[PDB]
Amino acid sequence: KSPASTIQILGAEKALFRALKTKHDTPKYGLLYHASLVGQATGKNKGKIAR
């Protein structure tokens, strides 16, 4: 029952909340960073694959 954008930021949601209430920007990777495919990119390309 959790949507795709919550599969992203499931673990490290502080900077998500710093982005929600303070006018900041969310993480892109989240708990999905340490998965076996996000790090298989390089650089900024590792951002979008987190979606």
Added chain:
RNA sequence: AGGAUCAGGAAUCGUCACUCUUUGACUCUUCAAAAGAGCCACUGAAUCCAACUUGGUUGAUGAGUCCCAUAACCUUUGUACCCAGUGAGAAACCGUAUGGCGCGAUGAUCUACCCAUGGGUGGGUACAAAUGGCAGUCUGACAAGU
């Protein structure tokens, strides 16, 4: 006799690298513009819209994970302290000719206010804890190549 111009005192190396600093050049480049050896043609490259293509709301792009929401800073409720230390002072006899726990340094003795040495209030300091505060659960439509 003491001082300053033209023997009381270290300095004779045919360089290899490495690092650092220094300035100068340099492709540029902001202050900030302004001037343009000018025009044609050929040819090349690049950019931008239209176009088309491929991929995409079964989610394209945009994005402060890590500065740790795994927190910081408090806030309330249960405990440990101190304005651990203090250190010499605490209580008045004796089984069948003779034998001892009868204290005590090797420790006796204690753990800012009112109430006659019974109880506690007040502040600092520390932690455990919070489904407590501070403190309110991402976007969503183009993207990219020629």
